[PDB]
Amino acid sequence: DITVYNGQHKEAAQAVADAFTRATGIKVKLNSAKGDQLAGQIKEEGSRSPADVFYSEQIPALATLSAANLLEPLPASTINETRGKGVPVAAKKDWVALSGRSRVVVYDTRKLSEKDLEKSVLNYATPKWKNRIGYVPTSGAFLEQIVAIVKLKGEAAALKWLKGLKEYGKPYAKNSVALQAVENGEIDAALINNYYWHAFAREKGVQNVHTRLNFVRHRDPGALVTYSGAAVLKSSQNKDEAKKFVAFLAGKEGQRALTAVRAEYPLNPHVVSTFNLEPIAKLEAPQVSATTVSEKEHATRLLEQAGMK
């Protein structure tokens, strides 16, 4: 009945779309792909494309469409649903934040305890962690991390961090490879996204896994949470149903359908995840502005400068 351009998790989107169809009888058509592609696709089509809703995993793609004036303002009630401090708010009230993923440190419990981990993620780029900390320089979230240290600590800090990691850390090609390295005991810890561990634990059984998650909190750059959100196209021919879908997305019922299959932190307060996720506000994630193209260019130049690229 409505067409959703989906830049978010495939299994995620499907779970929430189906829950929507069960509660309203409204059919959902998903067009999954890279968030930057869908947006520019919507942008190169403007008020003529088939998209009724844009469901993305990156707020920057929503900001672009917003900046190009292609999004339809949403009622306060919808946007009110996930409102919280530190939570991204749409200046023109044309998109809403829905969930988030957190950067984290996975560690080997056979060898370490929480009391052995660093208070700040910046502290890992030191001799003390020579061959004991792993990272994934080719990762998008790793890029987001560098972008956050620059906004939160200045470029010098970001450069210090990258040279320290290049110098003492151990790179892995993929976030899963990094995680499997800690699980097998070939490194004490590694920097990755939270959901990788949660997904792995659910499939094997937490009693069978030797890795655990550490969260820095205290607004540290390593406590970075990246948000996802959604919006309705001003061009939609089914603006009524699309508006409903996003309200469903932000609401308890929709938030429960998402956290039933995806380890993302619900933004709606009245929801508990099926994964052992603490209420987001307890992560003490720092406040950071959305990521821009220039910021990813700066962080990239820094990756090359450090020696990783």
Phi, psi of 166, rounded to the nearest 5 degrees = -60, -40
Q: How far apart are CA 159 and CA 291, in angstroms?
A: 18
Report how far residue 185's alpha carbon sits from residue 54's, in angstroms, rounded to the nearest whole number. Answer: 41
Looking at this protein, which amino acid is placed at residue 128? K
260 three-class SS: coil
The structure was resolved to a resolution in Å of 1.5
- Distance from C-alpha of 7 to C-alpha of 228, rounded to nearest angstrom: 10
User: Taking each helix axis from N to C terminus, what angle separates 293-306 and 140-153, rounded to the nearest 10 degrees?
Assistant: 100
Q: Name the one residue in this structure whose structure tokens are 């052992």.
A: 276
**Apex 197 CA angle, 196 and 199, nearest 5:** 70
The per-residue b/e assignment along 209-243, b for 16 or more CB within 10 angstroms, e otherwise, is: bebbbbbbeeebbbbbbbbbbbbbbebbebbebbb
How was this structure determined? It was done by: X-ray
Spatial CA neighbour of 96 closest among 70, 141, 63, 140: 63
Task: Set out the domains of the chain in order of their start, with CATH numbers.
Answer: 1-101+226-277 (3.40.190.10), 102-225+278-309 (3.40.190.10)
Q: Tokens 């829905």 belong to which residue?
A: 98
Q: What span, in angstroms and rounded, lies between the C-alpha atoms of 98 and 255?
A: 8
CA-CA-CA-CA dihedral for 292, 258, 139, 282, to nearest 10: 80
Q: Which DSSP string corresponds to 71-95? A: BPPPPHHHHHHT--TTS---TTS--
Distance CA 265, CA 284 (A): 13
Helices (H), the chain: 10-24, 35-43, 59-67, 76-81, 140-153, 155-168, 175-183, 194-204, 239-250, 252-258, 293-306
Q: Give how far Cα 131 sits from Cα of 124, 219, 285, Å.
A: 11, 27, 27
CA distance 172 to 11: 26
